[PDB]
Amino acid sequence: NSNICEVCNKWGRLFCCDTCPRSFHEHCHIPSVEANKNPWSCIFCRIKTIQERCPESQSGHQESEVLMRQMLPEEQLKCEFLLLKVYCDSKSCFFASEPYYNREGSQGPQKPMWLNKVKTSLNEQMYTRVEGFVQDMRLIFHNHKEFYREDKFTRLGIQVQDIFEKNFRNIFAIQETS
Template sequence: MATGTNKKSIRNDNVEWFTPTEFEISGGRKRSKKWKESIRCYEWTLKELIEKELLPNPPKKKRKLENSQQCTVCSQGRNLYPCGSCGKFYHEKCHIPPVEDESGPWSCVFCKIKDQAKCQENQACHKESEVLKRKMLPEEQLKCELLLLTVYQEPKCCFFISKPKQSKEDFPDLKEHMWLNKVKNRLNKKAYHSVKHFVADMRLIFHNHSIFYKDQRFGNLGDTTRKLFEKNFKRIFSIKKTSKQLQPCKQTVLFT
């Protein structure tokens, strides 16, 4: 294992040798694609054994890509990781969560949603109040990662990535400075305990922006990005419309 994850380092009871990814597939965990967490030695995952330095941490293997290829999020090149399912490219930290660089196949969050989802007709939609109360279980974590990544892919989001330069002292109504990279960091660390807390931070970004640029042309920029977020929030979490022209929800995303 010390030489890399493409080496056969795990032996089964039939004295057959496998790479970690091959062993994961042989155990029926092909879709997880996280062998460090799915493979166990007794009660310990390989990830825990590596962290305790009881197993060597396999060296990362960079994939050489052509200069013409660009990151789906930032549109820059170099040191990109291809999704094994859709073929799109991401930088390690542009993707949410960060790419786990392993020699085996890797799937972006869009494909993970697609792999786990089954769209069915005539499914009941959810109330927003019910969605916000949900605990941040793996299904909700994945949806929030997808939602945040859709915002990062919007060109106008660059205005909200870094910490605002405005001083809190100049804006007494400001509750807390909030920006996309701060939300991303919290989400990657799994610091949100419910969907409500994640959505509240996202909405705070645009609320603060409306305070900073009240009656200014930059105010429209925040409103446009906020509408994009709200639209995708309702779509990804299958939240039903509240307008008078309520249409029946024909699709929802179910997780197995």
């Protein structure tokens, strides 16, 4: 197994996957690494299993259909993995914890949002459809773009949104387009 966390790339108290060489800090894995369970399979392994059991699940989908899916176990897992893929980028630090807004010439967003809030919401089963999760994720980056206006720091929102969107299209097998 790897000697660093797959998400944050640091050593520490790591839990190792039994079916792949990845390792995780307890709260870096999503869901948080389960208490017992031997063997344990990580979220990467569990997602690969879904695909292997239903190969047709990788045929292209329309985003509109995906967003209306109810959050049954497999869609819950997919959103958890998509959230984890965002935290895997170091630039996610900017969006993890609760923001505050005091900048000359800007007003804060009406509805603040951050990754740890989405994480809690998933853990508490607060989203009934994929659309709920996706709307909160996209709102993180939209709030950031609107607040920072012409400051070059706006680009951090664009960058982390691109990670989100690429992974959304991969995980939910969105039909490729030009």
